[PDB]
Amino acid sequence: FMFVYLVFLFGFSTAVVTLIEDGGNSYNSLYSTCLELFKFTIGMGDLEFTENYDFKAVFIILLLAYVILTYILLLNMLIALMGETVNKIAQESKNIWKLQRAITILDTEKSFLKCMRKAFRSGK
Amino acid sequence: FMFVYLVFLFGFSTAVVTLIEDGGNSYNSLYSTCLELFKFTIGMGDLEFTENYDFKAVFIILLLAYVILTYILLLNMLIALMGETVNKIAQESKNIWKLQRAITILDTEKSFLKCMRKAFRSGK
Ligand code: NA
Ligand code: NA
């Protein structure tokens, strides 16, 4: 998810910062544009966070395309994939937890062997 | 999803901009109202973004109806449909990927035929 997300974010951030001319709040920075476009993902994205562009239609089209492609498409697809994965591994997780607890039991027994090596023996 | 979404958005934006009289921040524009109503979708919508209306009850009723119909209903329905689609095509996507890789192999082999037409032959 993060590989795909970062590909999209970097592509659109490079496009946006290329469009901006900074002539402003020094928004003509790759880091600042990347952060401002990432805010869109967490429901805090300002659609007009700058006005240092010669063409407003291009800027708004790029922002809307990014929003629809990541905020609406990628994130909901991730929700769907997480749901599918939860169903697939409903029973496998139980087995993994059992193995983890078994390893815990073995480690605890081996550590406590010093205090009582054969005192705690199973079965009669 | 976008056809339905745009039908709803345009209907309610036309209604809202018709209600507004701009007598303000020149909010009596179709583009501005469309953008302000689209912000509701990305979790950045101001419920009172203007006060140039003669009837406040009508304005707030329209905004609440739009919010409930798009933000709560349409988007969650899209989430559900994406989940259902992910389940349906869990196995088909694998076959499509295999076909894509096969086409890649054929294209690469045909391109490399010039360097060595028969040197890279399969089987003995
Ligand atoms: Na949100
Ligand atoms: Na928010």
UniProtKB/Swiss-Prot annotation, chains A, B:
Q: How does it assemble?
A: Homotetramer. Interacts with PIRT. May also form a heteromeric channel with TRPV3. Interacts with CALM, PRKCM and CSK. Interacts with PRKCG and NTRK1, probably by forming a trimeric complex. Interacts with the Scolopendra mutilans RhTx toxin. Interacts with the spider Tau-theraphotoxin-Hs1a. Interacts with TMEM100. Interacts with PACS2.
Protein name as catalogued:
Transient receptor potential cation channel subfamily V member 1
Residues bearing the modification Phosphothreonine:
T104
Which Cys pairs does UniProt list as disulfide-bonded? none
Result of mutating E36Q?
Slight modification of pore attributes
- The entry marks the following residues as binding Ca(2+), namely D46
Changes after translation: Phosphorylation by CAMKII seems to regulate binding to vanilloids. Phosphorylated and modulated by PRKCE, PRKCM and probably PRKCZ. Dephosphorylation by calcineurin seems to lead to receptor desensitization and phosphorylation by CAMKII recovers activity.
What are the transmembrane regions? 1-20, 58-86
**What does the record give as the function of this protein?**
Non-selective calcium permeant cation channel involved in detection of noxious chemical and thermal stimuli. Seems to mediate proton influx and may be involved in intracellular acidosis in nociceptive neurons. Involved in mediation of inflammatory pain and hyperalgesia. Sensitized by a phosphatidylinositol second messenger system activated by receptor tyrosine kinases, which involves PKC isozymes and PCL. Activation by vanilloids, like capsaicin, and temperatures higher than 42 degrees Celsius.
Tissue expression per record: Predominantly expressed in trigeminal and dorsal root sensory ganglia. Expressed also in hippocampus, cortex, cerebellum, olfactory bulb, mesencephalon and hindbrain. High expression in the cell bodies and dendrites of neurons in the hippocampus and in the cortex. In the brain detected also in astrocytes and pericytes (at protein level). Isoform 1 and isoform 3 are expressed in brain and peripheral blood mononuclear cells.
Q: Where does Na(+) 2 bind?
A: G43
Covered residues of the complete protein? Answer: 580 to 724 of 838
Q: Where is this region: AD?
A: 84-112
